[PDB]
Amino acid sequence: MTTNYIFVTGGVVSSLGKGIAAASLAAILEARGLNVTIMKLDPYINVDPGTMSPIQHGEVFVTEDGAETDLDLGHYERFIRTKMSRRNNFTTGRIYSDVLRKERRGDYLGATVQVIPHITNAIKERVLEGGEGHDVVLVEIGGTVGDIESLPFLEAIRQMAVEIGREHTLFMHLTLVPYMAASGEVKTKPTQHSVKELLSIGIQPDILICRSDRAVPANERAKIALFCNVPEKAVISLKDVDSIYKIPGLLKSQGLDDYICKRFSLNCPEANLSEWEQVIFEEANPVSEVTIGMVGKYIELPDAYKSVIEALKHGGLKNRVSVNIKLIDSQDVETRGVEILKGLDAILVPGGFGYRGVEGMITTARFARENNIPYLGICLGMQVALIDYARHVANMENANSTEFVPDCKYPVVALITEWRDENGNVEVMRLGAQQCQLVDDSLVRQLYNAPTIVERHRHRYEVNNMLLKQIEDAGLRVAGRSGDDQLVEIIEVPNHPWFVACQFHPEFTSTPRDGHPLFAGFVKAASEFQKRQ
Amino acid sequence: MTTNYIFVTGGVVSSLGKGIAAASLAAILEARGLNVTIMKLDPYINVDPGTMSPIQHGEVFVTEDGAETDLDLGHYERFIRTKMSRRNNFTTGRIYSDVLRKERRGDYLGATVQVIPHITNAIKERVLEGGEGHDVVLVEIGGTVGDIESLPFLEAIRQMAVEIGREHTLFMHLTLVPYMAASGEVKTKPTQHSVKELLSIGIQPDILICRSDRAVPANERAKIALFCNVPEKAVISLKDVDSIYKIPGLLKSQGLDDYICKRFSLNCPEANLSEWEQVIFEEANPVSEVTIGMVGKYIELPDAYKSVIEALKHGGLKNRVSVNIKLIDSQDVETRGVEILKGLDAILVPGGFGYRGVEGMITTARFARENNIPYLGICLGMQVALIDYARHVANMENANSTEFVPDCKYPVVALITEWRDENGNVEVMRLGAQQCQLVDDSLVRQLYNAPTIVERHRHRYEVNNMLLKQIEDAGLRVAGRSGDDQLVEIIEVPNHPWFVACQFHPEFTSTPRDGHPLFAGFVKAASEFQKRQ
Amino acid sequence: MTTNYIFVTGGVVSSLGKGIAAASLAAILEARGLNVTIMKLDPYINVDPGTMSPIQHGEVFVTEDGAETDLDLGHYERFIRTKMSRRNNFTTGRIYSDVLRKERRGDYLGATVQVIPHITNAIKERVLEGGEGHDVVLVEIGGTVGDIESLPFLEAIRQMAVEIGREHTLFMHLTLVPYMAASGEVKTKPTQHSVKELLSIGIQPDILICRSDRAVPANERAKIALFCNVPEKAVISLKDVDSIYKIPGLLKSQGLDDYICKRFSLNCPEANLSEWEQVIFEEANPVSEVTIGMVGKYIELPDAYKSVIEALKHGGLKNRVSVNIKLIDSQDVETRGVEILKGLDAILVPGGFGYRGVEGMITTARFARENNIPYLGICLGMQVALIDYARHVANMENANSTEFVPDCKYPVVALITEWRDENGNVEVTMRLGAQQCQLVDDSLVRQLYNAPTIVERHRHRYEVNNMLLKQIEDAGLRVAGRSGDDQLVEIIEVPNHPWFVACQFHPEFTSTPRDGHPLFAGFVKAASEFQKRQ
């Protein structure tokens, strides 16, 4: 059982949806009983996206093992059931960091360390490390063919195709076929030049995925097959769609999975996309509609809350409710007031870092609590919720977090080493999955329908346990704790229809096929609030 | 006084002599009164050539400040009088090491670190750092145009030409014009394709240097000018020569310096190459001939002793003696004996590391001392000389160095921390220039004609001062000491015509125009030994 | 059985010997019992090489059917026994002329005639026309990969591989591996960049022939295989050799024919190169050595007399004589005299056109006739021999050809429509291809060919004037061969001479190293006997 590889590249432009196209193809192959995995090769010099800002890169996806990776891995876990780890995403800076250390350590034996073979061997070893043990491995190459930054990746996979052999490797190249309003037709010329650019590096593509705002006609697909040494049946058309859940069905109708199984000599049953057909039906037929407002600080780039937005979509699928997400700036709450919070069936405050716009998130958690509006807080959303309750119900004046105000009197949120009290008395970066214990007779104990749950963390500041008892007596309820130190994970307000706030990131485990219990109840409570108007 | 830059690249093949061509052009510009400097941009991932083996890379040149650089800087210091430093040579691994540390330290403010502009800006800053403050700066780009490894360098200098402006930048491209025995003509086709490859990166060359085993005719130079958008007067012919000292004269006769001074708007006097005309005359008319044998361990690549071989050439220029250097393997001395040492007018043992073939170097230093054959030892050549005298004259049985035999009874050579004696009693990496004090009435005090001298070091193991007094009483003389610890630098044997051994590397300060006092006397004593046969 | 194609291309430079390497590969395949053929695709705009000077691309080779073609076809016939014709060589101008003709008629039906597919289809139709009907077809693509002129050829052959399939197509690419004296090694970088350029057009080479002044080591051949997606066994080395007849043996030892037969699924026996080993054995074991001087007007480019030079070397094989050919300028005879013709064991005067340097050839034909030096004239070499015997023996002063002096008194050589007398009386044109010639019984050429009629190839316009011929016959000149209905003179001889033969046709176009030629064999033998008497 030799492991087969499918290398995915992109040409013409960069906004082609390589990750979505790879995840959709992997969903078809997994629907035929195959063991499939996906990996992402990023060309930036950052060692990992942990040091990158959400305003420029997007959200930082977190795997089970605790790796900060590109958000494309969120697409992978939402299309296939194979768990992603650190081996599924590495960058150019990671490769050079490995080679530089081995060179200073003297592991190359005084040899001249060069791009070929030293840099290329480092790339090929990581692809084989995260690929071996599967039937089909999809390797997404970041960047656009023809740029400097992707050449080490492209030269490395070319060498793999030669040693592994053409009988177990495929090159899938995505191109742009733009439509011109002048001639009223789509143009295949950018595709012709891109394939020539990919050939000038030594790679002959085997499958061409044509991206366009409309279906690519057979006459244009025949011309592309003529100039690119590709059979016509291997030229697939992928139009712009309103729902990425339809893409697996669109690729199967053109026989993309059949051409792959034939090349790799795989005899597997027909792809059963019945789960995806169900998701398309649920999305296309909502019975209600709600308006949930997301109050954050990174709203200038909606990709900063990628998994959060997709988690609200999955909440509406399980409840047959059309969720209309409204991005509202938390700084405008400080400027204009809670007037930009009226007319919302629910309110969600996602995570973040930095004091900019936090006082607006505290005011937003207050408006949702005084007016019985459903509220869901994630990471920073739990901090501003705990602040509001301590500052306004527990009467802890100017309660804040040490991240924002280091020398505050009431540090309800602080590092484990920074824990103190209102007088100064003391006691004698969490990443990845961690088990959590739920409190009985709580709102989250009913939803999760289980005693212990597992979620993924990405935070530094915890809830101050030396100030928790004074808030609990003020009416606040604790629903989740974890670890030997019994750190607060989930908080609730029982005198409220729906008010749950958690420290972990539940949006990293939400899928369209299986949903998520927390977002299902949050959207369900949002529609019930809309009914009572 | 804006600083002008001349970027030097190479095409077709890599063995073109880019460094020699750049050094020769810099010698012409310096002959017109201009302040010129040269820098080398290497495309390998090694942070510095310090961790590279001489068998693969060549000799490791050492500058005054103590930097381990490429051997091309040896060509630079032997053509111009501007001192080289760390700022005159950096590698791709150096650039990525800088960017990776700033990214982990958070100096990019959460931005996406990319090849452009982050990697290119790091390159442009080092070129400006080592270039500003001069009239003309020659930047040699390692590698061949069209390869992956040189693209960051080529994209970086393209951006400099745009900002600095074409009025102060030039691109000089070296190509190969091979001769075919079939058609009896030279072929310009590789040059035509190379310029197209250089244009596909965004660089339009301004001067073309045509390398060939013979002069490039005017008809071929006119065809190259036609297909490359270059004026015919800017197409220079550089044939294969028997002496690189003629290359400045060959470039001046074609007006290469005039075209550069006109572009940069420099009004300087005519190049006075009278010193180079003298060196060519001295080399072309030797009055005697000697056969000096160099006994080492890296002789399988003669470039491992690049500066040593060139230092013997400079010794013959000052004495009008034709030096015929013979590379002999020190391991063959251990196998076949001193029979491969007969018929030598002199013997030289250069530096090195490792126990392989050292016992042959000890036997060679013994054969040159018992037969009154002139001997010169550098670094390791002084260690094996001190061993022979201690092992055979001072009767220190099995005397060796701790690098080779760590637990020997007589460690005449050891680290400063490893110093001991024959019983085990103790007391209560040097790089760059260091002042040395010479002993009066010594052979080196006469040659250097000065009390204190400055030479460059590259070694770890020193002479054991606790075992030096027992060797001095055996007749051995100490000629040089340095530092507060008074480390042994130069040793001599007075009952010998010529027997000098030093710890520093004198070959790094030898030039064809000014020679070197140590190699001048060594070759002079080699001819006197030839007369007495 | 399906016809297989082997496309041959060149990179880095142009002087790689693509024709010699293709012909040598075809000789191996023919030695295995395969029906093989070759064809040359020239990228110049000339419709046919007939309108080209010999000091430009070389000699103008002539086939049996009368087609003026590139000289590479001369290498083909000297290596394989398959006869070449017009459909074995065409140019870019030939393609555009055909497409422009169909477009002016209207055969494209008001369509936009474009490089693709109209020009590319015209190329593919001609390759299939001269290719279909054989087992293996070698298509040599002229020019260097990466230039503009060869791009229509490379795109057309790329489309053929897709339609035919890779089970019957192979791409063989020749590159240059130069040796650097500065590093003492050969360089594979020009090959790497050339393959990338061939890939950017859409062609992935299958075999790489490495040309160098020495054998390419295995480490370099392994590095080339690494960067070019080519298996290491398909990287062949082809050093510079002193004798081109050794090349078939060199390609066989590296298993080039075995790799080709495996790809095309051909079951044929092992090649037998005994006929080539015999030629090498004859060439490396001479018993005598002679010096034959060739006096012409195109000596500045030795390839202008390519087939003549090779014909003299074939004559030396049949006689075990090492021939030293000395090229002499006919103009230097006009200025410096016949002083530069001393020390020659024989004199050969090839063909040509133009009055420039003809008077030096007439003087040379006189030198070899008076001093009894073996002489052989071809086309123009017969004109200057006929002029010499009429101007200096038959006493017809200022006798010349109308090509040179149109209004002369004795036009011994003129067009058939120009035939006249010394008084002006008349009687009551490009010859190309093979034509039968009848020989005279008691003649020297009759015993050499040992047959009454022969077949040789012509390329000339001016004929021997029959109206002034009988006056030269009575002067002592012998006519050895005539042809056609008009009894045009083909071969002439001088009896009072050891070996003096001149012919109108080009016998060098039928000479081969394995079979020789009867006329050149006797000429070299006569040169050996002259050297013995001195």
Ligand SMILES: Nc1ccn([C@@H]2O[C@H](COP(=O)(O)OP(=O)(O)OP(=O)(O)O)[C@@H](O)C2(F)F)c(=O)n1
């Ligand atoms: N490698 C190539 C490819 C094409 N063409 C020339 O391209 C010309 C057609 O140009 P168009 O109509 O603008 O491009 P298209 O191919 O039709 O693809 P689309 O229209 O979807 O962008 C032919 O005359 C040609 F001649 F075919 C060329 O010269 N060289």
Ligand SMILES: Nc1ccn([C@@H]2O[C@H](COP(=O)(O)OP(=O)(O)OP(=O)(O)O)[C@@H](O)C2(F)F)c(=O)n1
């Ligand atoms: N960009 C180009 C350049 C040239 N050529 C074509 O190249 C052809 C000449 O090819 P050669 O003689 O082998 O190369 P050379 O130019 O003479 O240089 P050298 O001989 O020193 O290598 C022209 O017909 C051409 F037509 F000029 C081309 O098609 N496209």
Ligand SMILES: Nc1ccn([C@@H]2O[C@H](COP(=O)(O)OP(=O)(O)OP(=O)(O)O)[C@@H](O)C2(F)F)c(=O)n1
């Ligand atoms: N596609 C490529 C190929 C090579 N190189 C880089 O080319 C560099 C080696 O340079 P060289 O020695 O001059 O070329 P050679 O391959 O050895 O072939 P020859 O020497 O026979 O001409 C590597 O560091 C490299 F890194 F391998 C590159 O950057 N991109």
Ligand SMILES: [Mg+2]
């Ligand atoms: Mg079109």
Ligand SMILES: [Mg+2]
């Ligand atoms: Mg040419």
Ligand SMILES: [Mg+2]
């Ligand atoms: Mg090399």
